[PDB]
Amino acid sequence: WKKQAEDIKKIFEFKETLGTGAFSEVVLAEEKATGKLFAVKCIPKKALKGKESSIENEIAVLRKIKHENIVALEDIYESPNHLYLVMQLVSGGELFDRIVEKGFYTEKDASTLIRQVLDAVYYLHRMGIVHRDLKPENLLYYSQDEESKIMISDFGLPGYVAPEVLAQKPYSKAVDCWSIGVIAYILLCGYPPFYDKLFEQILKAEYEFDSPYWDDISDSAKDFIRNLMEKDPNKRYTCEQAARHPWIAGDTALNKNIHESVSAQIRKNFA
């Protein structure tokens, strides 16, 4: 299944860096043979010393599985000193940019986005993957199209982080469900639920649906968010429980244009 390369540059022309990490870089690459674009995750094998085999076994599972709402793993190249995970390039644009650029945006739009994220995350959890890094930067549109799905653009083999992680307590898949709750909060008002003391507010899950920003938001949406942004990970909704909530599965999401306020808050609260 793994392709071998003496030099990855025989296969790909590398262009702009999309993301950097601990001994991992995602770069825009053109396949020389075809002209097709990809997002290539470049990993030094030295950084995988001890776990190489386990990570390869897990890559070997995921290369066979495409989720509608997750970046596809298209190929894996092995050079003498690197692994290259050739990922689907998700090119439709960024999450907050779309909302700001739209003239019209409703709770049903936010609910449609969260439903897709819950589907993707439920799948990762079944495969034994805790994402741990769910935030708007990892959510990109497939296409510039009106009807484009959203996709988790990247995953690994403070304001978005669960209280139990900040508490240095044991944590589980539930940390992702907290992050989806925080993203849902921002999608409905345009600002983060925690900011200052900040650490203490997250630790105590101290947030509010403050006026006027939350006045025209449904009680159902507020209840949905309360069930995900729940301090106790045992009490917190799973992805499965969230996907059954009427705001996702039913018809409680409102059809009021809340674009003006959400777009103003996104512009004011982010760089």
Ligand X SMILES: CC(C)c1cc(Nc2nc(N3CCC[C@H](N)C3)ncc2C(N)=O)cc(C(C)C)n1
Catalytic residue among 97, 109, 133, 210: 133
- Residue 89 interacts with ligand X (CB under 6 A)? yes
- Residue 138 interacts with ligand X (CB under 6 A)? yes
End-to-end Cα separation, the chain, in angstroms: 43
Question: Does the annotation mark 223 as catalytic?
Answer: no
Q: Which is nearer to ligand X, 88 or 172 (CB)?
A: 88
**Which one of residues 8, 27, 29, 39 is an interface residue with ligand X (CB under 6 A)?**
39
- Site track for ligand X across 176-215, x = CB under 6 A: ----------------------------------------
- Give dist(CA 85, CA 217) in Å, integer: 41
Q: What is the 3-state secondary structure (H, E, C) of 137-199?
A: HHEEECCCCCCCCEEECCCCCCCCCCHHHHCCCCCCCHHHHHHHHHHHHHHHHCCCCCCCCHH
Q: Which is nearer to ligand X, 139 or 262 (CB)?
A: 139
Q: What are phi and psi of 37, to 5 degrees?
A: -95, 145
**Which one of residues 8, 11, 12, 18 is an interface residue with ligand X (CB under 6 A)?**
18
- Give dist(CA 182, CA 231) in Å, integer: 12
Kindly report the number of other CB atoms within 10 A of residue 167's CB atom. Answer: 13
**Which one of residues 31, 63, 137, 246 is an interface residue with ligand X (CB under 6 A)?**
137
- Give dist(CA 81, CA 57) in Å, integer: 18
Name the one range near ligand X by CB under 6 A: 55-63, 90-98, 107-115, 227-235: 90-98
- Residue 26 interacts with ligand X (CB under 6 A)? yes
Name the one range near ligand X by CB under 6 A: 135-143, 174-182, 248-256, 257-265: 135-143
- Give dist(CA 151, CA 168) in Å, integer: 30
Q: Which residues are catalytic?
A: 133
Q: Residue ranges for the binding site?
A: 18-26, 41
User: Residues in the site for ligand X, rule: CB under 6 A?
Assistant: 18-19, 26, 28, 39, 71, 87-91, 94, 137-138, 140, 153-154
